[PDB]
Structure formats: structure tokens, C-alpha cells
Amino acid sequence: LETWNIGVVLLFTVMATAFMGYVLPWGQMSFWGATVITNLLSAIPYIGTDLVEWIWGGFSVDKATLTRFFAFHFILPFIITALAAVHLLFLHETGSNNPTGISSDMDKIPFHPYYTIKDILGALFMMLILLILVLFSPDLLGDPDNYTPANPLNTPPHIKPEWYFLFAYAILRSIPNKLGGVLALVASILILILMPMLHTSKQRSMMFRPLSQCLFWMLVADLITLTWIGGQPVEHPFIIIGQLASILYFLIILVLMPITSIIENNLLKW
Amino acid sequence: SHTDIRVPDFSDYRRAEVLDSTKSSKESSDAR
Amino acid sequence: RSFLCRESLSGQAAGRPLVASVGLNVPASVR
Amino acid sequence: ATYAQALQSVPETQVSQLDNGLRVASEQSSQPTCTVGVWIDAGSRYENEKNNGAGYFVEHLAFKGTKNRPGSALEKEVESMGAHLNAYSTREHTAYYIKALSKDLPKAVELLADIVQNCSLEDSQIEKERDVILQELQENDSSMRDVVFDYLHATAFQGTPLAQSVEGPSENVRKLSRADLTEYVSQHYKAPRMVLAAAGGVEHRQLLDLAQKHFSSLSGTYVEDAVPAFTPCRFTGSEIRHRDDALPLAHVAIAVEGPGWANPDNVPLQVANAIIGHYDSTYGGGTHMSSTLASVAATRKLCQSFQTFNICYAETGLLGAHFVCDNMSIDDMMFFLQGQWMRLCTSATESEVVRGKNILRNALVSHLDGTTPVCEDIGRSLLTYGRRIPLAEWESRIAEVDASVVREVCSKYFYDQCPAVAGLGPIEQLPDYNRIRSGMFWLRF
Amino acid sequence: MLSRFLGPRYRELARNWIPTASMWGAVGAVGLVWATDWRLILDWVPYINGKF
Amino acid sequence: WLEGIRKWYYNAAGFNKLGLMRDDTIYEDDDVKEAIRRLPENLYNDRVFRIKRALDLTMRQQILPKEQWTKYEEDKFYLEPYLKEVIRERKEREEWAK
Amino acid sequence: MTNIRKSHPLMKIINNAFIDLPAPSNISSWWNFGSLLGICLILQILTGLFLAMHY
Amino acid sequence: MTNIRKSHPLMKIINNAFIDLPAPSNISSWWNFGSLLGICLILQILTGLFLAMHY
Amino acid sequence: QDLEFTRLPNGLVIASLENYAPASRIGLFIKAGSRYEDSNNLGTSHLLRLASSLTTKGASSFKITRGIEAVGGKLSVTSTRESMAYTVECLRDDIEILMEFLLNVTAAPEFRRWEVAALQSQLRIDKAVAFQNPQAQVLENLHAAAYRNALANSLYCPDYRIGKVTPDQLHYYVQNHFTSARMALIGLGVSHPVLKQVAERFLNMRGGLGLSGAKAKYRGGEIRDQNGDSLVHAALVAESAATGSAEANAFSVLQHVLGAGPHVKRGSNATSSLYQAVAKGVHQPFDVSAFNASYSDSGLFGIYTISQAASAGDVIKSAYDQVKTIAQGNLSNTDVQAAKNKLKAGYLMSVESSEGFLDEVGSQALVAGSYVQPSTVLQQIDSVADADVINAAKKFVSGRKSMAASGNLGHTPFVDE
Ligand code: HEM
Ligand code: HEM
Ligand code: HEM
């Protein structure tokens, strides 16, 4: 539980860092997306409007917002490093979990002789992919509209965040109410903290719960659908598809998984 | 030998209320 | 226990068989 | 016949009063044995610095020689009928009770009269008795429980006669001559401050005329004018730390100022002191005893034995707990025990209050079986409360107290009150005094 | 959980701790109004509305 | 009837392939570790050997051969009585607390 | 004499962290990403510094 | 059950580093300049960040 | 308001007395103990004595502890060499619940493996705590060196059996020495009807007499250990006679003739012949007292001594010599009368307390099966004559003797001298 909560905090901090950093090049997409995302905080009741004046450093996103975003983008990754150290401490207290879910205390191997070179191979593969992206398709995921001076006199054809932001932004799009949209957006990540409570199956892992495996893959496909919808404009039929997938996300996480776990336990004499 | 153990006199540091050795300390504990 | 006195030693000389005894919320005792 | 019906039966404690002031109290019953004793108000509380320890010396020499009885002839007579004569001198009272059969009552009263009245106090016996007290002083110094309580008394009531040890410092016992003892006997063994108690096959009328025919010579005179006066003592929240690492275990006793002998708040307090309870390693309950602190201690084998005491003198008393544990448990219990107090101070429920009520009722009823406990109860109650409180009244007071009463009483006694901790042994993990005092209050309440 | 907190002694604890927690809530509300200088509340209180 | 569905699920679960009985797969919460401690010596030794062999197998990613799989009718709920006793004791303590 | 690996404080922490820390044998590749994240953190931070040197 | 101060991981480090750390009983004011330095870090870091948001 | 000494057909004998006391105590006395232990199950009785709170058939350990504590009563399992006494007590309005808990503990234990394994360490803890006082070791070695078997067994688990007593041994001990014919339920402050109902309701399940023990035969050993205590504890004792006999009362009178126990606190024991006899000579802290242990099959009478290491030779000798004088017709009639008065007082004084009366009735029910009024016991004590006392002294002097010693034994004389 402790490692999971610290991981959720790390994930929050990483999203904030990336959102903030994408402003720094000050392209058309950077400034316009920043305006939209920060203006989303206006939906907060009472204080909310003042908050967007506070974050902007004025009436709208301007140079003060850019420099404060730069400073916060500098400081935050070191907070991420400290939180990662704490996350590792919490995990190291109890030890990692094997895919089976059964305690592996009887069969434990030293970390240095084995799980250093394996991580070396993993990091090398990650570098293979990353330099493939950098050296052959540099501006692949990034929108070309960033390579344009940020002109506040011209709204871009479509204002969209990064591919790793389009799913929660599509969730925001799905809900009609502005405040409810922000609530759904924050809940779409905060729901990870509820996961320790929603577990009801007697087996910790999923290797022996095929129905839960199908539900998990349905959830993964739903997230892919959210990302694709967030990429697309809010038109027919993208509106209905995005809405339905947004409902199915929470419905799977909160309802289908626990009920499936109850049926799972009942199917195994226990 | 333990009977020979005695607490030294703290009257140099004691507050005015607890200075006397006859009156109790509960009534002055509130004010202190 | 130190028993370096005749008067303090009085009664320590047992004269009846040992009888063990332990309670549930009472400390164990012997005689 | 339910508890209430059996409680009323409770043969009474008819109390009379001789013209000399000796209040003769008895408790008739059916057993053929009896306990007759004289409870005098004489202890370390009345002793001064110069003669501290005279009471212990007089208790030692009481059975030795009594003029009319030449000496060991007293022992011969006492052992002739199988009577067991015993004396216990606490910090306040001092009693000489004969544990004998009912038929030997006329002789037993005479023997007690001989001891309390006509004592030879021979100088040679004083010299012989001087060594014994010094030896007993070394034995008490070896007594690792007695010395921590003496330390608590010294550090709490510092600068007051209460802090004086019952036996006395091992300097007065090497200087106390016949003159000091005779003054102590004259000024403290007075008829008004005496209770002639006897429980068992004792007829109250018989005890009355035996006292009249034997204890008449006692007078309430006080020489010219010198009248000893009870001097109220002050509770001084302090700390004494006698760290001796060679000792195997560590004794720590923590107490705060509590009630007096005559104060209703005594009844709820014991109930609270029953909730915390007591534990020893050889209990058997282990991880299941309802007392939270006891269960916690048994789960981790924290202590070897913790108990809660309710030492209560006339105007003030000591309320707290004495626990014996290894070196690296003193901190933990100091966190836990205090916390328990805090919980009892903060949020107490009727369930554990009822449990404490039942425990206190059981303690009172079971403590009062046999002739000697009843005789001791009569002798102490007449001197302290001015009367023997019947068990029915105790039942009424215990029925009155509930969770709100316990909470308010503990708050008035425990909450944010400076303690009087006193340690012995390898006391190093024992938290600093400011840590203990800070533990006395809870930042949530 | 749900049932294990649904007991008589648990509601006894709740009743015991209602005053302290409730007026801790007042402590927090007063501290928030103080820190933010909330003119909606601070206007009504006397001798402080003069600061506005 | 339902037992066919139960057998199909047991086949599709996976821990029968790894030579694991049912109780080897249960998450180890406080009740479960206390019950495991409460196990007799022989059952505990067989359990730990089975778990270690399964972890080896999934490390190598080799399912245990077909013939000596844990059959449905040969699956024994060894942990179940101890776990039931542990749960009953915990429930009794909680009722006393309430 | 004692091991500098498990007696020196910094080295003791490193040893208990990722030298002699017991680990499950059947850990799949899905856990490697953890370390990858740390790598993808450092490889980020360093690069960011250089970017901050011309921004 | 047990004290969180000496059982929680982070709280254990804080407890044995700053709360229950056995320090010498007679350290003078000169030793206090240690803590000031750390404070003079934080007090100056927080300010230093706020200039970075307008510089 | 009297003792109704009913006995059931199965063998259980119920005694009760409605004293109308505020508190009530119910005790089950079982004719089981160390003497019925064998060479294999040594220390099982100690575990059973420590086994008073484990999960029973109809009451879990947590339930038993919580119920007994909330009711406020207690549960003590005081045991002897040949009898184990379970006893509960509390206010008279709720003795039903504690009596049922006791009944489950006695006649329905489960002895779960995990709980017994956890309890194993309590054996070592209790043995150490009880052995802190030197008298326990000396008496245990006396019993080891006095009888070949049976009574030779210790009340405490031997070091090699600590952690080895399995629940199977406990179950064998239970349904081999807890049958109805060898137990007695005695109640103080309880009515006979309810006691009879609970007796015929639960304890009737274990019928029969059970596995009989074995007779104890004198071995005349001299078990000696050099513990290193400053005070040497010694005990020289000969087989006196079985309890419940004329020789038993004669030896009991001889015990007080010799002197046993200081009546006056911090006294000199003038009447005690042993104390005065040894007082001449040695001039260092010393105690000597007659020692009597009247077990059912056989009894032990002798001298117990706590003396200085250097003087241990004298105190053992002179005290023994005193008995010789009593053996060779040197007992005054006045001394016999004084000893008889002391014995009568002691008997009427042990039964004075409610617990004393409880264990007295339990012992009478278990051993003799016929409770006699205290006046009858006093009459039997008065029936003893001087010739019987002088043995009794002859039997102690002539018979072979077992000796036990502890401390610095560099000067303790051996049994051969
Ligand atoms: C800043 C990025 C992160 C870093 C550097 C990081 C670091 C690590 C590392 C190195 C491990 C061990 C390897 C592994 O199990 O994968 C780990 C385990 C874990 N992390 Fe993270 N983590 C991060 C983000 C997260 C997030 C977002 C979560 C989820 C909220 C999370 C939850 C966990 C969990 C549950 C484990 C234990 C997995 C297991 O034992 O099988 N972490 N973390
Ligand atoms: C947590 C790890 C980090 C993440 C996820 C992150 C994310 C980003 C992203 C997405 C951008 C925009 C890239 C683009 O222009 O398309 C960016 C820009 C930038 N980041 Fe970071 N960053 C991280 C760490 C850092 C650190 C530690 C620094 C400072 C040392 C830094 C300094 C910068 C600078 C100066 C820019 C502007 C240059 C540019 O946009 O290319 N970053 N960051
Ligand atoms: C080792 C600690 C540090 C010291 C001793 C330090 C010292 C200084 C000094 C003396 C100046 C010049 C101020 C002036 O001339 O008025 C300065 C400038 C600056 N520092 Fe730092 N600094 C430190 C750390 C930091 C940190 C952590 C930040 C960012 C969070 C920062 C941000 C700045 C900025 C933006 C300036 C330029 C604005 C200015 O001159 O005040 N510094 N620093």
C-alpha cells in the first residue's frame, strides 16, 4: 500500500512536470494547450477563477507563466528523485512480488549477480527504441504545430496535448459539466489509490484469474480508445465513442473487477 | 544504604508557591 | 534474597512438602 | 441468596470507645480462631530527622522484654497456646496483633497490653537489636522492589517527613539510644490514637471489659504540652535515577499525587487502576488478557512484571505504576503505560469500566477472608476513615461510578500532572523527564 | 471496515471524541479564515473589519 | 450443471499446470500467514517445496509436464480448516471488541 | 576486519539496496521497467541540464 | 500495537536522526551553527526558487 | 449451612457449603500429579498445570480469558505431588459462568499443537521463577533421593523435556488420570443442587478409575549439589509413615515437639527444642525446623536446616543429636501438651481462610473420602500419647535416611556420618 501510494504521487508529479515542460519551447501548441489546461481550473467553484490568475501570473499565459513554468520544471524532477528513493525504501522493506503472487521467501537470489545485467539488457533495449525514435523519426509523436512561434492571435486547427495526455483529456471532454469534467479528469488517475481496497479475490496476482485477465485487457483497450478519441476532434461519432469508453473505464475498474473477483472466489470452492 | 539516599535541597530554584514544605502543590499547580 | 540475619532467616526453613501453584491473573507461587 | 443479600449479612463491626480514648472494635463470627491487635498511629510520617527510624527500633524491641514478662517468657507464653504474634510498622500506622484461638482471648489481650504499655526497652537488648536492624537494612538494599518505592517516596515528598524511610537512614540506627525510643513511645503510643481490634470468635462485650480491665492504665496525657501534630506534605514532581548497570533487570516506578484516605475520588481511581491491571510473566493469559497494556507487554515480552499501586496517606497519596523490565523496554512501556493512562483520561467506555468495577468488587471481597485481614481492615479503617466502611457502602460507591466519572477523575488526577518517576538498575533507555512530562498530555485532546 | 466499526463501544468512542474533533474543525476553520483574510467572514467580526 | 464450469475454470486457471494445489495460490494476508504458521510440519514442507518448484518453473517459463498435473478430484484443501479456525478466532475477538 | 561493502554506511545502504538484496527468481521483464524508469529519469535529468544551459 | 515513531520506515529515520538521537549534554552554542546552515539552505533555497520565476 | 458430602455412582464426590459469603469458590481436586508420571511423560503434569487457558471444546482461549477477567474471578491450578486442584472464584451472582469454564478446562481440553508449542517456554520461565528460592531445589532433590519412583518425580518439567512434551502425552494424562472416581468437586458459597447438576452433566463423560500409579519405595539417596549459595540448605529425612494413620499424627506431634515455624516474628523460638539445642554451640545465622510430608502411600519426617557454609557440619549434627535425646525418653508431658496445642491451633488456623477450608475439604474427599469435622481432628490429635511420639522419634533415628544438600557443601557431613 505505501509503495503504491508513493507511486501514485510520483505519477502525479511526472504528469505535472511533463505538462509544464511542454510549455517551454513556446510553440503555438505549447501556449494554446497551456491556456486551455490552465483555464480548466476556472471551473473550480469560488476560488477557482482567482487560481487561474495566480497560476498565469496575470490575466493569461504570458512571460511570467513561461518563466515560472521553467523554474518549477527545473525543481520538480529532484522531488521526483526523492520520492523515488522513498518508494524504493518502502518496497525494499517488504520485497518485490513475483508474477505468481505467492511469497517467494523460500526462493530468493542475490540482486547483484543476476538482476544487474538483466536490467542492463532492459536499459539497452530501451535505449535501442529511444535512439531509434530520436535518430529516425524525431518529430513523430510531437505535433508539427509546435515548430511555429506562439501567436496568441490565431487559434490552432485542433488543440491537443501529448499522446500520454490524450486519454485523461478525452475523459475531460466526455463529461459535459465543466467542474465534473475536472473531477473526472483527476479521478481517472486518483482511482489507482482505490485499487488496494477494491481487491476481493483470494489470489493477489492475475495468472490464475483468466476472467480478470480478460477484464484487464478490456481496460487496456479502453485506455487505447481514450487516447485515440482524445486525438480526434469532438464530433460525431467521436463524442459518443469517447463518452461510452469513459463510462466503461470506471465501470470496469470499480464494478466489473470486484464482481468478477467474487465470482472468481465462488468458482474455486472458496 | 538506600535509606541514606536523600534528595538535595532545591529551594534555590523552586518557585515561590512550592517553596513552603507544608502546603500541597495541587492548588498552585494550576497557576504554575 | 540476602538473609544475613537470624531473625530475617526465621521461617525460611521449610517443614511441609512443596506445593506448586499458578493462576490465570495471579502470579505463580510455591510452598 | 444473591450478592446483595450476602453483602448485608456481613456481621457488623460494633465500635466502642473507652474513657481513655481507646476505641475498642470487634467483629463477631463463628470460627474458633481470632485476631486481636492494637493499631497505633505511629510511623515515619511523625518521626523527625534526628530520630528517624525509632518506630522500627521500638517494633523490634517490643517482643523482647516487657518488664512483667521477663523476656523470652513472653515468647514461651505465646507459643504455649499456638498463638502467632506479629507486628507490621508502615509509614503511618504500627500494629501488634496476636493470631490466636478464641478461648485464649483473655490472655491475648493481656499480652498485647504488656507489649503496648510496659516495655523494658533494655539497653543491652538495644545494643543487640542495633546490629539486626543494620543487617535488615542491607537485606532491604538487596530488595530491588522496596528500594525503588523508597526512592519514589524520597523524590516525591522531598523535604517532608513522608519521604523519610520507615527503617530510617543507616546513621540514626547507630545513634538511637534509650532516651530517644522512650520519648517516641511516650509521645506516640497514646490511648486516643489506638484501636483495639479483634475479629473471629470475639464477643464485643468480652473485648470491652478485657480492655477496661487491662488497657485502663493508658492515658492521653502529653507531658507538659508537647503534642505531635500532623504536618501536611507537599508532592514535588521530580525524578531520581540510580543507574546500576550490574543489576539484571530494571525497576521503574512512576506516580502522581492522588487522593487522601478520606476522599470519594479514591473509589473511581482504583476502578481505573483495575482497568490497567497488573501482569507477571508467570500469568498464562498472555496475549489474551483484557488489559491493553498487559496484552501488549505479553505479546512482545516487553516487561517481566508491571503492577499498579494506590498508596494513599491521610492528606495525599501516590497513584501510578511500578514495572520491572529489561534495559530496552523502559522506553516502550513509558510510551505505552502513559498512553493507557491517556486513553483512560481521554476516552473510556462503559465496558472496561464495568470490568474494573467487577475486578474491584472481587478484590474487596476476596481480600476480606480470614480473621487477620478483617482485623487489619478494622484497625486501619477506624484510624483512617474514622469508621469501618461496610461492604454494602463499597458496593454503593462502585455502582455509582461509571465511564464519565472515571474520565473526569483521571483527567483531574492524571492529565497534565508532573509525575514522580524513580528508577533503579540499567535504566538508560528510560526517557528524559521532559519526555515523560510531555507524555502526560495528548495533543489530540 | 463497515461492520467492524459498527459497534456499541465504537459509537461510545465517537461520542467521546465528537467535542475534540468538532472544535478542532473550528480551529481549522478559524485558521483558514485568518490565513486567507476571508473578507466574507472577517467583515462581520468586530475590530477586524477596520483593516478593510 | 455447475461442476462442469468449475472443472473448466480449474483447467483454465493455470496453477494446476505448475503442480500447485489450490491453497498454494492464496494471497498471504495476516490470517493466511498465521494459518501457514499453524500448519503441521509435513504439510508445510510439501507446501514450500511445491511453491519453490512453481517459482522455478515460471522463472524458466516451462509448464510442468501433462501427466502429473494436480487433478480436480485430487485437489485437497489442506489450509482450509486452519484458515477457517483463524477467521473464526478473529471474528470472535472483533465481536468482543464491539 | 569487516566487509567495506556491508560495513561502510553508504556502501552498506547500496549493498542492501541492489547488491545483496534478496529478489524473486521468477521476476519477468515487466519489473525491469522499474529500473528503466530510474534510467529514464537520469537520462532525462542530465539532458535537461544541458538544455537549461542554452535556454 | 507499536509506536509509529520507531516502527514506520521514514518515521524511524526521523526519530533516530532528530528526535531520539543521543546528543552530548553540554554542546555549546557553537554546535548550533550546524542546524542554522541547513536552515540557511532551505530559507535561501525557497527564496532562490522565487527569483527563478521572474529572472 | 452445613457440609453435604454426597458421592455419585460414577465416583465423583460432591461437597458443598452455603456460607452465604459475598464471594464463592468452586474447586475440582483431581488425584493426578507427579507421582503418577512415568519415565517417559515426565513433566506432563507441569504442562497441564500451565495448561489452564488453552482452547477447550466449548470455549476458545480468548473467550476463556476475556470471560474470566470480565467477570473478575480467578483460576488457580495449585498442584501437589499427588493432587492437582483447579479452582475458580468470584462474586456469587455469576459463579455459573466461571464454573462452566472450569468444567470445560478440566473435562474437555483440545490441546492444540500450536498453543502447546507456544506454551513450552512458559515451562522454563515458571521453573526458573520457582527455583529462585533455594527451598524448591532442596525439596525436589530430597524427593528424588528419598523414593525410587512415583513421589520422586518433580513438580517441574526436567530440562531435557522442556519443549518435548507433545499433546498426545497431555491427552493420555487426561484420559488416564482425570476419571470420575479420582476427582472431587468442592464448593464454598454454592448450593448443592446446582453443583450436582453440573457434576452429572459434564464430568460423567470420563467414567472409570483410570490408570493406577505405582507404590513409592525408599531408596535412601544422598543427592548433593554445589550450587554456591552462601547459605547451605540441608535436609535429612527418614520414611515416617503413611498419612491418615496413628503414626502420622504421632509424627505430626513430634514435628511441633522438635519445633517448626517461628510463632513470634523476629523471635528466638524458645519452645522449639531444635532451635535451642542448636543455639548452644553455633553462634551464626542459622535455622533448623522439623520437616513432615505425609503423602498417601508413604511419609517423610526429618530435619531441614539453613546454616552458614562453615557451620553446616555442626547444625546438621547437633540438631540430629537433639532428636536422639527425644528418642531416648526425654520428652516432658508439658512439651507434649504444648505441641498438641500448637497442632490444634495450626489445623484450625489453616482451615480459617475460605481457601484453606476449600483445600482441606478437597484433600479429605480425595484421600479419605470421608470428611470429618474439625473437632474430630482435634480429638484425634489429643488421642496421641507421649510413648507414640518418642516410637516415632525412634523410627526416625533407626531407619535409613535420605539427605539433600545445596550450597557450598565443603563442610556438610554425609549421610554415612
Ligand atoms: C518515478 C517513476 C517510478 C520509479 C523510478 C519507480 C521505481 C520502482 C522500481 C525500481 C521498482 C522495482 C522494480 C519493479 O517492481 O518494477 C518499483 C516497484 C514498484 N513500483 Fe514503482 N516506480 C515508479 C513509478 C511507480 C508508479 C507510477 C507506481 C504506481 C502507482 C508504482 C508502483 C510500484 C509498485 C506497486 C511496485 C512493486 C512491484 C512489485 O513488487 O512487483 N511505481 N518501482
Ligand atoms: C522528470 C523528467 C523530465 C521530464 C518528463 C521533462 C519533460 C519535458 C518535456 C516534455 C519538454 C518539452 C520537450 C519539447 O520541446 O518537445 C521539456 C523541455 C525542457 N526541459 Fe524538461 N523534463 C524533465 C527533466 C528536466 C530537468 C531535470 C530539467 C532541468 C535540468 C529540464 C529542463 C528542460 C528545459 C530547459 C526544457 C526546454 C527545452 C526543450 O523544450 O526542448 N527537464 N521537458
Ligand atoms: C548554494 C546556495 C546558493 C547560494 C549561496 C546562492 C547565492 C546567490 C547569490 C549571491 C546571487 C546573487 C544575488 C545578487 O547579486 O543580488 C544569486 C543569484 C541567483 N540565484 Fe542563487 N544561490 C544559491 C542557490 C540557488 C538556488 C537553489 C536557486 C534556485 C532555486 C538560485 C537562484 C538564483 C537566481 C535566479 C539568481 C539570480 C537572481 C539574483 O541575482 O538574485 N540560487 N545566488
Residue numbers in the entry:
A (entry chain 3C): 110 to 379
B (entry chain 3R): 79 to 110
C (entry chain 3V): 47 to 77
D (entry chain 3N): 2 to 446
E (entry chain 3X): 1 to 52
F (entry chain 3F): 24 to 121
G (entry chain 3C), H (entry chain 3P): 1 to 55
I (entry chain 3O): 22 to 438
Authors' text:
A key group of these are the respiratory chain supercomplexes (SCs); these which primarily consist of complexes I, III2 and IV (CI, CIII2 and CIV) in varying stoichiometries, which serve as the minimal functional units for NADH:O2 oxidoreduction. Here we report in situ structures of porcine respiratory SCs, determined directly through imaging porcine mitochondria by single-particle analysis combined with cryo-electron tomography (cryo-ET). Our structures, with an average resolution of approximately 2.5 Å and local resolution up to 1.8 Å in the best regions, enable in-depth study of mitochondrial respiratory SCs in their native states. Our in situ structures also capture numerous reactive intermediates within these respiratory supercomplexes, shedding light on the dynamic processes of the ubiquinone/ubiquinol exchange mechanism in complex I and the Q-cycle in complex III.
